Amino acid sequence: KIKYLKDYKPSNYLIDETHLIFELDESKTRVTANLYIVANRENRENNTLVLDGVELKLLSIKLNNKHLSPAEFAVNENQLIINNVPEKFVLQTVVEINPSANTSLEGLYKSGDVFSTQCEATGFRKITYYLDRPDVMAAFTVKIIADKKKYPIILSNGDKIDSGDISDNQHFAVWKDPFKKPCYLFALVAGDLASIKDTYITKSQRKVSLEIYAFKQDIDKCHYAMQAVKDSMKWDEDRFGLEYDLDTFMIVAVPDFNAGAMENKGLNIFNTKYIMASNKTATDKDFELVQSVVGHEYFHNWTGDRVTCRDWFQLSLKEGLTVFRDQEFTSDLNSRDVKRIDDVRIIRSAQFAEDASPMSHPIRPESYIEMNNFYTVTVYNKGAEIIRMIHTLLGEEGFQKGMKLYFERHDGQAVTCDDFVNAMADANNRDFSLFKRWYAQSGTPNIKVSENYDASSQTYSLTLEQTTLPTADQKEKQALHIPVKMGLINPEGKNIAEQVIELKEQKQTYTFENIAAKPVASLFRDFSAPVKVEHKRSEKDLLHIVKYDNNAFNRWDSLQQIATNIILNNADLNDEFLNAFKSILHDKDLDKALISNALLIPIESTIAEAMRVIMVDDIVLSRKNVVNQLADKLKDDWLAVYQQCNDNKPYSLSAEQIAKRKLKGVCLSYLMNASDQKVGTDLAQQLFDNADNMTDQQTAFTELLKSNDKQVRDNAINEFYNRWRHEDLVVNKWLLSQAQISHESALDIVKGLVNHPAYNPKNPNKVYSLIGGFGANFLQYHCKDGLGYAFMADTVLALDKFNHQVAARMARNLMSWKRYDSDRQAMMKNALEKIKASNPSKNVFEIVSKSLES
Template sequence: MTIQRTDYTPYPYELPAIHLEFDLDPKCTLVHTKIDVKAKADTMTGEALILDGEAIDLRGLRIDGQSWDHYELDKDLGKLIIRSLPRACTLEIDSSCNPSSNDALMGLYVSGKSLFTQCEPEGFRRISWFADRPDVMSRFQVTLRADPDVYPILLSNGNRIHAEQLPDGRQSCVWEDPFLKPSYLFALVAGQFDCREQTVRTRSGREVLLQIYSDPGTFDRTLWAMESLIRALRWDESRFDLELDLDRFMIVVAADFNMGAMENKGLNVFNAAYVLADPETATDSNFEGIEAVIGHEYFHNWTGNRVTCRDWFQLSLKEGLTVFRDQEFTADMKAEGLDPARAASARSVKRIDDVAMLRAAQFPEDAGPMAHPIRPQSYEEISNFYTATVYEKGAEVIRMMHTLLGEEIFQLGMKEYFRRHDGQAVTCDDFVDAMQHAWQTRHPERDLTVFARWYSQAGTPSVKVTTERTSEHDQIRLTLSQQCPPVGVERNANIEKQPFHIPVLLGAINQQGESLTLQCDEQHGQTLLLELTRQSQSWLINGWTQDAAGSFLRDFSAPVRLEISQPQEALHRLARHDPNAFARWEATQILLSNAVLKLAELADDGQARTDLPESLTTSIHTLSDTFSLILQDTTLDDAYRTRLLEMPSDKYLLHQMDQMDPLAVAQAKNRLVQILARPLETALVQIVTEAQADGDDSKDVFDPSALAAGRRALVNLALDWLCQMGSTQGKALALAQYDRAGNMTARLGALLALFRHPEHDSAVLDASESFYTRFQDNALVIDKWFALQASAPTTDVAKARSLMQHPAFNRRNPNRVRALLFQFCANNPLGFHAADGSGYQFWAEQVIDLDRSNPEVAARLARVLDHWRHHRPVTQDMMQAALQSVADQSDLSPNTREVVGKALAL
C-alpha cells in the first residue's frame, strides 16, 4: 500500500500518559498497558480509537476498569479498533509476545541471553497495542519484573524511581520518563552487563550520571566510548548551548542490531560495532566511527527527541539536522589542539570523507529507481527510506542553510526552533520557518522560499560554469546554469521542476599559485559566495587575471555536479596550490577520475593497452610529480595527504560512464596506481620504514588522536600502493608490519595490502589464517576478517559460498551478513560482476533467503542492483533476470518488493 504525504491527518485522540508493566520471559513476555485517553476538541463523539499491533496476542481489554466488548481485531491489517468510547477514559490492555522468535529484530527480541527493543520506525506495535506514530506523544512510566538470576539489570527510559524484590523471588524496577515522547523512542533492556559509569557536572552545575552497559568481559573496551560521550556532551553545550536534561544518560550494547544505534530517550541502544574498541581489536576508522555515532545519538536528545517529527515523511527533520551536527563535532575534534594551518587541513578531512560518501552512496541513489526528495512524497515501507538521501543529503541541505546564514544567525535560528517547538512533533517546514525568522531579524529582505525546494524535489542538480572575459581589465562574466531533470517516481508524475537555491563558493589562484582578491557587487575577498536561484544567472567578477585558475564550489558548498571545462594545467595548479583544502582535493579527484575513465575506455575486452596516448601519459606523469610534492609537504596533516592520494570510489566513477563497466573500472584503477606508484616507490618505502623505525605500529605507544591516526593512514596507503604495483620490498614491509603490529589499524592495513599483491602466495594465506586464529573469539574482529576476504580481488562466488559455510558465519547477525554478503555484492567488482552472471544469481538467492527472516536487511541488500539499466546490455540482461527471480517470489516482504519492483519498473 502506498502512503502519501498529503494524506496526513492528525490523530483524533490524545494519549498523554501510558503505564507499561512487563513480566519478562524470552518465550512469553506478558505486557499490561494502561493508557489515558482523551478525545481532542474536534473529534466527533463515538469516533473509533484505532491502535496498531503486530505479532502480539490480545488477552484482555478494559475501559475504566470494566470489560469492554465494543472492539474489532483485524489481524491482517494489524489494527485494534475500539468503539463507543467516552470522551475521556482509561484503557487497559493485556497482551503477550514471544521475543525469542523475533528474527526481524524489531520490537522486543532476544540477543544472546539478553532482551532488547528496537522501535523506530514501527516496532512498538510488536510490543503493545498503541497509536504507533510519531505525532502521538505520551509520558511513559514502565514497570519491569524479571528473574534476577536471568536478568539482573532492568533498564528503560528516563529516571529509575523505584526498585524492590518481589515475594515470588523476582525483582521489579520502575522507570519514569518526565518528557513527552512518541512510542518509537521507547526502550527496554534486560540482561547481565558490565557497566562503566562516570558522574560529570553540566555547564549549569547539575551532576549527571553517564553509563555504558556491555556484555560481561567487555568493560575495558568501553573506555573510548565513554570519553566520546563526554566530549559530545561538552561540545553540545559549547557549540549549541544545549545541555543534558535527564539525571542519567545510558548506552547499552547489542550484538544483534539492524542499525548503527538508536536514540531512545535517555537509553540509547547501540550496535556493538559502535561502542567496543581498543587498539588491539579496533581500527582508527572504528574509533572515529564510535565517536561520531555516539555524538550523533547523543545530539538527538534535542534534535529528534525534545523536538521530534510529526510523521515519517519528516524524517530528515531529525536525521539531516543531527548528521550535520555530528559532522561538525567530528571536524572540530579532528582539529582540536592543532596550529591553524594544520587544523584547517585536518578539519577538511571530515568534509572530504563526507563528500566522498555522498558521491558514492547518495548521488547514485538520486539517479536510481528509489530516488526521492529528503522529504519523500510517498512510500510503501518506511524502513526503505532510512537512506543516504534523508541522512547525508539532508545534512547537506542544513549545511547550505548554515553557509547562507552564517554561524551566528544559524545559531539564532536553532534557538528560535527550540523556543517554538520544544516538546512537539513538527515538520521540516517548521524548521525552515524558524531559520528564516532568524535570517530576517538581520536581513529583512532575505527568505528561504526558493531554498525550500530542496525538501520537495529529488535528484542531483548539475551546475554548468562558463566564463568570458569582458572589455574591462581583469574582469570576467561568470555564468552559472542549473538543470535537474525528473528522477525516480518523478518521471511518472508529470511535474515541472523548479530551480534550486544553490550557494556556490568560489575563488581563483594565479600562475604562481597565489590567491587572488576578487570583487563582485558588495563582496570583496579571496572567496566569494554566489547564490544561484534561477535557471541561469551571470555575475561580473573583478580581479580575475588572465592566468587565473578558477576554484569552484569550495568546501562543496552545495550537493551538485559541477560541469566545467578546465585545462589540465589549471587542474594540476589547483591540486598543488589551492588554499581551500577541499578544492585542492577535488582537483586531484578530477585528475584521477579522468585518468581512470580514459584507461577503462582504452581497455580492449578487459586487456589493458600497453601503448597509451601521449596526452594521457603526460597527465599521469604530471600527477605523479604532484603526488611527490604532496608526500614531501609535512606542513599538511597526514590524514589530509592521504586523502589527496586516494583513488575515487568505484561508484563515483561508474556514474560518470555512459554504460557502466565495473570490471573495466576496477582494472583501470589498479593499473593507474601501478603507473603512479613506480616513480614514488622510494618515497613510499621511506614513509613505511620511518614509521616502523619510530614504532608507530606498537601497542605500547598507541595514540587514538586524529593526528596519529592520520600518520597510520598514510603508512597503510603507502603499503597498499607498493603491494598493488607488485613491489617485492613492499610485500616484505607489509609482512613485517603484520608480524609486529600492536594495533588493529597496522595489522589490518598490512593484511589488506597483502591481499592486493599479485603474488597471493602461502605467506598471505598464512597471515589470514593467523589473523582468524588470534581473534576467533571476538565477533567484531571476525566481521573484519569476513569483510576483508569478501572484498578481496581473488574472491569469487565459489569462495563467497564457502565462507558462508564457515562455522563463524551467522546469518541471524546483521553485522556478519553485512561483512560477508554486502561486502561481496557491493564492494567486490571482480567477483560480483563475473562475466558469467554467477554473482547476480548469488545475490538473488541471498536476498530471497534473508527476506524470510529479516526483511529490513534483505531490502538493503536488494538495493545493490538499483542501477542495472545503466550497465552494458549483456550485463543488463543478467541483472534483470536476477531481479525478476526475486520479484517472482509470492511471499516477498513489502520492504523488498518495493525496492525490486521500483528497480524493474523505472
C-alpha cells in the first residue's frame, strides 16, 4: 500500500500529556497509560478516536475514569477504535507485553538481561496504544518499577523527580520530561550497568549531570565519548546559541544495537562499537567518528526533538539539518577543508549515482511504500547540501537569524520543509519561493559554462546554463535557484571580485567591468551547489587555480581534475605540473591535512567513475606510472617532509598533530611507490617498531605491505598479529590490510585467511573486513583471470548458509557488470548466474536475479 504526501491530514485528536507506569518483567510487563486527549480544531470531521497498537494484550480500558464496555469500542490487529468521544478527556489503558519474545528490535525488548527500546519510526505502538505519528507531541511522565538486584539502573527521558523502594525486593523511579515530544523519541532502559558520571556548566550557569552507561567490560573505553559530549554541548552554545534544556543527559551503550545510534530525548542510545575508543587501539579517524556520532545525536535535541518533523516525508529536514550541523561541528573542531572534501566525495559518488539510477527521487518524495525508502543519501546527505546552500546565500549571521526565528515560531511543533525555508526567508527579508523547488525536483543538474572577454573595455562576460535531464520518477524539470560561490584570478595571482552570485534562470549572463587582465575563474567554491559542471579549460588555467586561488577546495578540485585527465590520456607527467605539485608539498601556511588530500592521486575506482566503459587495466597501469614518477622525481622532497612531520612529541588529538601524521603517511606511500624501496622500507620498518599509537602503526603496517620482498610482508603480518590477538577491532584491520595488498598473491592470502581462527563467517564485521575489503581491492578483485569474481560467488553461497543479509551485501560486489568491458562484465554475470543456479535463499536469489535482468 503506497502512502502519499498530498494525503496528509492533521490528527483529529491530540495528546497534551502522557503518563506511563512500567511494571517490568521478562514475560508479562504491564503498561498502564493515562492519555490526556483533546479534540483538534484543525480536523473535526468526525469524533472517532483511532489509536495505533500492535501485539498488545488489553487488560483494561477506562474513559474519564469510567470503564468502557465491549460495545463502546473495537480492538483489531493494528488499532483500537472508539466512537463519539468527548472534546476533552482522559483515557486510561492497562496493557501487557512480552519483551522476552520480541525479536523485531522495536518497542520494548530484552537482550542480555537488559530492557531497552527503539521507537523510530513506529515502534511505540508495540508498547501501549497511542497516536504513533510524529505530529502528535506530548509531555511525558514515566514511572518504572522493577527488581533491584537485576535492574538497579532504571532510566527514561528527562529528569528523575522521584525515587525509592517498595515491597521487600523492588524499587522505582519517576522520569519527567516537560517538553512536548513525539513518541518515536521515547526511550526506556533497565539493567545492571556501570557508569561514567560527570558535569557540564551551561551558558546560563545551570549544572547538567552527564551519564554514560555501559557494561563493566565496555565502560573503560567510553571516556572519549564523554569528552565528545562536552565538545558538542559547548559548540552548540558558542555557534548556534543552543543551550541544553534538562538537568541531566544520559547515554547508554549496548552491543549489537540495530539503529547504530538513536536521538532519544535526554537518553541517547548507541551501539558500543560506535562510541568506544582506547588510546592504544583507536586511530585518529576512529576518534573523529566517535565525536561526529555523539555530536550528531546531541544536535537532534533541538533539530528533531524540540522541533520535529510533521510527517516522514519531511525527513530531509529532521536529519538534513542535523547532518549539516554535525558536519559543521566536525569542520570547526578539526579540518574544514578535509571534512568538506569527504562530504562532497559522497555526493559525487553515491548521491549522483542514486539520482542516475531507477531509484532516483527528490529529497522530499511525494510517495513511499516502506520507511527504508527514506533512508538514502539523497534524503540525508543531499538534504544537508540544500541546508548548506541557504547558509551560502544568507551568510552565517543571517542563517543564525533564521535559526533563531525557526525555534521562535516552532518550539514544540512538528513542521514541514517549507516552514524551515520560510523562517530562513522571513528572518532575512528575502524571497525563497524558487529555492523551494529543490525539495520537489529529482536528479542532478548539469551546468554548462561559457565565457567571453573584451580586451579594450576590460569586461569579463560569464554565461551559465543549468539543464537537468528527465528521470524515472519524473520527466518534467525546471530552473532551480543555484548559488555560485566564486572569484576571479588575474595573471598576477590576486583574487578579485570575490562574491556569491545566483542562477535563478535557465540561462543567465553576468558582467564584470574594470577587469584589466583576462582572468581564470574560480567557480563553485566549496561545492556551493550539488551539480555537475561542464567547464572545458586548459591545464595551465587549472594550474593557475591550483597555484593562486584562495579557496582550498577548488585547489584540490582542480588538481584532482588535472591528475585524472593525465591518467586517461596515458600521458607522461608535465614539467609545470611537477613544480605546482612540489610547491603544494612545501607550503608552510596551509592545512597539512588538506595537503595530504591534494597530493594523494585519485584511487582507481574514482577515476573509473569518469569512464562509460571501465577499462580496468588501462586505469591501473597509467596510475602506477604517474605515482611511480612523482615518487622518483620528488624522492628527496618526500623524504624531507616525512622527517619534518616525523616529530618526537607525545601522542595528542590536536588538529596539527593529526594533520602531521597523515601528510607523514602520504610521504611514506610515495617512498614505497619509488623504484627503490630501500629508503621507504627502512623508515616504515622503524615507524612500525616505534609508533606509540594505532594511527602510526596502521600507516607503518600498510606501507610495509607494499614491500616487494616476501619476507618483509610476511613478518609484518605475523608481528602485527602477535601484538593484537587480544583486540578484535584491531584484528579486523589486520584482515582488511591483508585484503588490500597490491600483489598477485592477494587472493591466495585471503583464501588462507578464511580458514584462520581470526576469521569467522558468522561474524558480519569480519566479513566486511576480509571479503568486503577484497572487493574494494581494485586491481586484484578485478584481475583479468576472473578468479576474484569466482571467489566472490563461492563466498556468497557459503555466507548464505549462516546469514542471508550479509550474503546479499557481498553480492553487490558482482552487480555492477553494466559498467565494465565485455570480458569482466561476462565473468561477473557468470558468477551471478552461478549463485542463482546453486539454490540460494529467497533473499539472495531475488536480488541476484534482479541485477541479471536489469
